[PDB]
Amino acid sequence: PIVQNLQGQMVHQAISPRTLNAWVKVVEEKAFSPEVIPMFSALSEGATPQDLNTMLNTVGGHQAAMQMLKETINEEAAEWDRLHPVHMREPRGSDIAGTTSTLQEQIGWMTHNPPIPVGEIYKRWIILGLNKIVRMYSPTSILDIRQGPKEPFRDYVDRFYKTLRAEQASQEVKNWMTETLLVQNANPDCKTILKALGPGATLEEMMTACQGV
Amino acid sequence: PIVQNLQGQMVHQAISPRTLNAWVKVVEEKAFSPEVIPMFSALSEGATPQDLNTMLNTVGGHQAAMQMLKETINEEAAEWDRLHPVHMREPRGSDIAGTTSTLQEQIGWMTHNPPIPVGEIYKRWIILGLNKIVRMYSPTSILDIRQGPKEPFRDYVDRFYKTLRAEQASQEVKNWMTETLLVQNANPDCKTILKALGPGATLEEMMTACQGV
């Protein structure tokens, strides 16, 4: 992060050991379940590109996913270099990624007037690569999520919406999926109950109606 | 949260990694037992809508419950947009929910004079959705809570009042329930002891009288 010194200078605060250990635990245990991305975004609040790189470098497992993340960051940096032709100096994509910029340049940009928020720009490129990884690490298609003959509709709904969150289709497609597949893939009892509610039923109405099945 | 900078500016403080981990543990383990809502409310003291969204997004399980929560937040935001027609700018319901507002706008409202407390307004909509989830995740009707033939009256009272807390009827109905069902559903020994105390007996008197049964 960045902190104001008692002398009034813009100063780096290192990402704490407990914040790094929390991130390492999250990536190691949750293995790109979708909640990894909100947790990354929360653990990297106000992070410089050096802090973001520290988080990504400290991941020991999943090195294929980290290579896909690096490839995404590189094509996002190249796209920035395309969209922002070269003339504080203006940062190149490699400067935003923190490969060709010093920590002092990063803080110089992030505290400029107006700020050039290279930490947030880079964090967008990271999250945009984690999106692809979470989508790929999703173990099932939403079309594969079907309710068991004796499975509670609540457990099926949990599986369905966790899969829908990982697959991360557009909202119009998620709307079609929750309207159509969630009913269609329910077991015959629940499917019978749910059709009786009509197409306008909310998820709370559906889960209430199926709560005893 | 919000903090005053040494320069006197209103500044964001990120929700700490340990506070997020505490919330994630609470939702994962306690699975919308009613104490989840006081714990949410305590962990989100002074939270901006961005902090509240961070807490809700970091929940990995229970995605059906999180969809019911999102649906509640959306109808509360729509009700705000109905009750507050559009003319610092005034926040829309999507701004209070932190979907169409920046963190800087959120802090601008929360530190205005008078403040527009969009974090507390949004936290009310969240708690109001968690109320519905806790009521739905209640495993038993209060009518189903009956004392076993050899069950201690204290364990039955614990089950009864935990169910009464989750079902969260109005106070007049809770009064009728604790007056009527708690005696009626006691086992025949306790039910005999409790009727002898008359209708005015307090719970401490009831639990004392049944303490040896």
């Binding site: 979708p34 999106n131 989508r135 | -």
Partner: peptide
């Protein structure tokens, strides 16, 4: 490209 995993807020 995927829409992201942020159920709540501004993604």
């Amino acid at each position: 490209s995927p829409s992201g995993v942020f159920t709540f807020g501004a993604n």
